[PDB]
């Protein structure tokens, strides 16, 4: 058996929509986190065989931004690079695909994760035919290609309404979970628990460079009362609000992967061994249930029981879906998203899966957790999961 | 682990703004997915995952690979995703599918590529807002598909770079394009694309139209018409519209499973995937990609170049193709025997799966044992895959 | 009492939408008509004091296309020029306004009319504030700024339906009117009656200049059957169709104005004397009724009865409204649009008023008619009318 | 011997580019000024015969914004309305065109002036032919149709440079003039001298209506040093800067006109009698010189010497051109733009001619000036001037 380790890992801070990284291309965020994982493992950019980056919204950024991030990071031209899209699942899925490159003896050293600038996503129109007369639409690729179900034509937040109703999750319960996520994240932030995983990013300016190293979407002093004033965002008699869904965000996150024996030759003390992974499909109307079969198949492939897990990162696309997954799987909620989740931290789609992986790993190192699981729901009706054991 | 291609299908390749001018990529993908199932005799319910290369998905909606999958009747339980190694994507996707199976994560994979260059939109980033002055609406087909991100120029400039390096004449590159057209017109007329093509039905308001012929192939291609063309990228250049491939639409896929599985199902596979490899090269000379990628593929298969019976080497430009032939030194008679991308067209994310199909089906026809498929990639890469027949 | 004459007049052929003049800016057409009126009067460009050109759709054409047209035509930089917009009324209203320049002693020689390139009208969006997220429309300025009612939000065609209903005008009556417009226009064209009024226009090419001197929108051999098969274009239970409405078209048309005393000094035999004009408002919902009060008011001011008129040009925006106007005024339809109207000839919005003035003046001359009237309905609920007498 | 008076007048505050009126359609600003002139004169909306509004940048605003403005202000559907465009000349030219409707007996009561939203001007492109392949430009219509010379291809600011070189006007002279304009405007705003002319405009807001009644573009405490450090904006070795040019601005301004005998019957004390007006062309290259022949011609027509004038408003498109006009005319600079000019106040193009008329009229009344003149330069090479005497 192969045995592949996460040697090192790093993420930018998650930026607020049209905020800190409002004008920063995904691959620039990418390059920073690629350099990061190299430096942190003590491996030279010249040793990297291939870079694999999940990205959902790459229109107008030019040819293969995975290669632009690779090349900017100083990964030599001789290496290879590609992007991929399994939507919200992409940044964790890229990690599993890198693992496979090594397992099959096609690569020795892989940098894998994801990057997203939802800010820099353009508006678009098909205009070759040419428009003889009449208005036409300029389509927001963020919304069209990121947030709109292709089969049912509505937003992801409507899929969360479907799950809410399915599981009979109240507005109060979904708000209670949001305020708890914000509080957990504000606590971890203040306590320095995100410092290890975050690599600062320098936004180059005209009248000044600006170093970003703090998650800017977390709201300080989140109360239940403010949560409860909000209006439903997708259904007028609905439960889901801007306050209990994640936001629109920018960021990047990566992991350096190699064989267990290679990390040992190099004196590297890996963050984890990738024990299993699994991806599964579900009905798109209730895509927020994805993590349930994916996490169960992952655990099955680890040969692990749910109760064996010491720490979980289960992405918070919406408080409605997150509460459902927790309810179903039954794992102790106190070991879930201990430093808060995507409602607080944000949801830079193609990067999210590597973002939460980062957060799991560094917290597993911090508390001395042995066994961890990362899981995400996926628009169009999928889920992805990964099991990690500490060395 | 021994992973075979059970079956393969591709759409005909359309001309830019032509047969598929208003057909979303994923509808071309779905036809190709259903065709691989049907040809193998495998139920859609049995597919674990669909992996589709695609370079130009803007505005087509969430995860068009999943859209293709669902429209093809693959149940909601399966998974799907897209990937982009530019022109390698459609072949790389097949290596990626093979890997899912070789690591025991999946049993049956459909893999390939899909591209509508015609449906690629224009775009601009407009959230900041344009306070004053003119701005550009960007052709994502050009920006995201054909322009080098490091040097800022069109792929055809990289093909010029290779032409100067390998001292390839305008006559030589024209000779290669006329030769590719003649081969592809002969093949077409001879019925040699029939097997590999699945017809696609363009749904219309005043009539459905069935597309089952590659419409970019030009009939009666003469050196004269080639020799009159003006260079397309350098005013003192050698690259033209006629000795470069085109902008095109299409899909192409393969059904992958283990060799033991194929035999349990009584399926006579198109080939066993013996190796593959991808390597990087200077972006400036990206057309050279197939050189290191086919040597590494050949070294991983444990084959010599002389062992190959048939080769598909994608013709992005006459100059890069001639260059790769010259260095690898394989018999040009066994290379793109039914023509190439110059004649056939070059639907970016689909090309690698396109040339795979041609190779597989021609191998079966003429009874070749060992084949190789390879492509150059924008940004400076190569991908290659070694196939042996059962 | 000041007396102003129309010394000379000319118009381009009226181009089909995206047809002969598809890529010709409105001011190039205008310049040709300016040159033509000068040459027909025996007046030099040096002598013009001001150019006044109606134009509804100048977006993207640059600073003040009226000045562009004047300068191209050799009118000296010491002259002045300006555009105006009273929608369909514009090309006729420009004439009245140029008569007023002379009447108040501010100018001696005016060129006035209108020009329009519906073909070259752009699509637009307000983008300065930025579009933070979600789709936006690229608006067709031709439809938005030319053809849509600003108050009720519907197309001019809907105002036509409102008039069809009010006056109980059958589909059969409108279609017959439309077929009669085509057939009269075709006859006039074939017999050479548009030759005098038309100045040929040279579309400069690349692989060859093309001279345009024939109205291209006129359908030859128009049948009642073909009119009858068309579907209503604005209201699914409607009566107004593409066939019994005017079209989208390009063209220019002008008049050279001076005092009666000045024409006499120059030895010019003028096309006519401007005896009166008028403009009046009506309800936007039935804008097609504008010509009713405008004509009555114009006639009152001239001291004429409806029965005094020898020829009439009443613009055919739509068969419904044309029929309503004829019914209410009660003038002999055999003297109205004797050479066809806009259903056949086309409707280059800002040019149309001076286009039907041209047609009226050259027909008055041909047939020896002493008294004429030109009138148009106007988007937003107005009418304009002018009374002309022969010298 | 017709004598037309200005019965009442009003303007909005002039907003900054994308400032107070950033999302306010021009006709909304026009409607408030229409209402204000009516209330100020004691004339009812029912009595208005026509509304005439200069406007250069109406693209995307829909059919005939002048009619939109009128209708909004409650001017009856039976009145008429139209827009016109002689660039910077427009708002003043409309007042002359308004005068002429009364003089020729075609109307009794006119509201005339101008309105402009430079902020709301869209970007556009001609897309009907259709873009086969490649990038294309979205054109800024405010720059294209408002600010760029159609003959020479360069900005109005280059024409200012040409005037600077011809009249040898230093950077120090232009900057001193600019600072003076700011400091005069600031003192006037502070002392309340814009109150009488300004009608407050209510900007309707989701989370609050905002009343705008102060000119927001005037810089308070403007320093010479601030002006001196700017880089030339149009030529690298040039002299014209963003500081000694006018701005991009939004606003509206109008005058209610009637015969002198009519104002007498109603007991209205008019703001002034329109004694004369003129418009003349110059070389487009030196368009800022337009006020010179236009003001001389206007004075000739009034039978006045330059020395008879008690107050002048000479629009400050650029310091360079304002200086050249003042030098050539030789009028006492202490009677010119007494309360500041467009450098400070701003330049909402189609409204500007009416804006400066408002300032002249209310300052004439305040100080008891008997004889006044308003003039502006005009893109494409023209000037317009009007003479006003007090009753
Ligand atoms: C009415 C209008 C919307 C129709 O535009 P359109 O549908 O794009 O024009 P088309 O020519 O394609 O009309 C559809 C059909 O009518 C047919 N046609 C028009 N008149 C016909 C007639 N005389 N007999 C037979 N066919 C006729 C065309 O051949 C066409 O056929 P197709 O569908 O096969 O191409 C457009 O002309 C319009 O907005 N005009 C009104 C303009 C206006 O209101 N001007 C301002 C005045 S207030
Ligand atoms: C001149 C022009 C091109 C400048 O464009 P701009 O760069 O977008 O204008 P900005 O305000 O952003 O830039 C001017 C700078 O000088 C400063 N500035 C402006 N006026 C100033 C003054 N009076 N004193 C000191 N500084 C001043 C501003 O603060 C700004 O500095 P900043 O960017 O650090 O904030 C533009 O205003 C213009 O086209 N105006 C001319 C209008 C015209 O031609 N009208 C028609 C006449 S025919």
Q: How many DSSP helices of chain A?
A: 12
Helices and strands of chain A, in order, run as EEHEHEHEEEHHHEEHEHEHEHHHEE
CATH topology annotation of the largest domain in chain A: Peroxisomal Thiolase, Chain A, domain 1
Compounds present?
Answer: coenzyme A
Largest sheet of chain A: 10 strands, mixed
The CATH architecture classification of the largest domain in chain A is: 3-Layer(aba) Sandwich
Family (chains A, C, D): Belongs to the thiolase-like superfamily. Thiolase family.
GO molecular function (chains A, C, D): acetyl-CoA C-acetyltransferase activity
Keywords (chains A, C, D): Acyltransferase, Cytoplasm, PHB biosynthesis, Transferase
Pfam families (chains A, C, D): Thiolase_C, Thiolase_N
Features of the shown structure:
homotetramer; 10-stranded mixed sheet; two-stranded antiparallel sheet; 14 strands; 35% helix; globular; binds coenzyme A; transferase
């Amino acid at each position: 058996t192969p045995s592949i380790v996460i040697a090192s890992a790093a993420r930018t801070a998650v930026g607020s929509f049209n905020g800190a990284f409002a004008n920063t291309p995904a691959h620039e965020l990418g390059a920073t986190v690629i350099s990061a994982v190299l430096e942190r493992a003590g491996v030279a950019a010249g040793e990297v065989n291939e870079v694999i980056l999940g990205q959902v919204l790459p229109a107008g950024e030019g040819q293969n931004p995975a290669r632009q991030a690779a090349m900017k990071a100083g990964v030599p031209q001789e290496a290879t690079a590609w992007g991929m899209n399994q939507l919200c699942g992409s940044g964790l899925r890229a990690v599993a695909l890198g693992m496979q490159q090594i397992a099959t003896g096609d690569a020795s050293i892989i940098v894998a994760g994801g990057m997203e600038s939802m800010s820099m996503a353009p508006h678009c129109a098909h205009l070759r035919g040419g428009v003889k007369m009449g208005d036409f639409k300029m389509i927001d690729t963020m919304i069209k290609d990121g947030l709109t179900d292709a089969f049912y034509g509505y937003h992801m937040g409507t899929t969360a309404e479907n799950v809410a109703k399915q599981w009979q999750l109240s507005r109060d319960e979904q708000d209670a979970f949001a305020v708890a996520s914000q509080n957990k994240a504000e606590a971890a932030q203040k306590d320095g628990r995100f410092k290890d995983e975050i690599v600062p990013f320098i936004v180059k300016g005209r009248k000044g460079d600006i170093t970003v190293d703090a998650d800017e979407y977390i709201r300080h002093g989140a109360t239940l009362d403010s949560m409860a004033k909000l209006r439903p965002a997708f259904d007028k008699e609905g439960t889901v609000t801007a306050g209990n869904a994640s936001g629109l965000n920018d960021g990047a996150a990566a992991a350096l992967l190699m064989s267990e024996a290679e990390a040992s030759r190099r004196g590297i003390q890996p963050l984890g061994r990738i024990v299993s992974w699994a991806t599964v499909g579900v009905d798109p109307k209730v895509m927020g249930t994805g993590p349930i079969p994916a996490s169960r198949k992952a655990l099955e492939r680890a040969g692990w029981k749910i109760g064996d897990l010491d720490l979980v990162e289960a992405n918070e696309a919406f408080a409605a879906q997150a509460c459902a997954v927790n309810k179903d799987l039954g794992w102790d909620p106190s070991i879930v998203n201990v430093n808060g989740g995507a409602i607080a931290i944000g949801h830079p789609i193609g990067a999210s899966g590597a973002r939460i992986l980062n957060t799991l790993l560094f917290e597993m190192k911090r508390r001395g957790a042995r066994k961890g699981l990362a899981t995400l729901c996926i628009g169009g009706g999928m889920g992805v999961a990964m099991c990690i054991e500490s060395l």
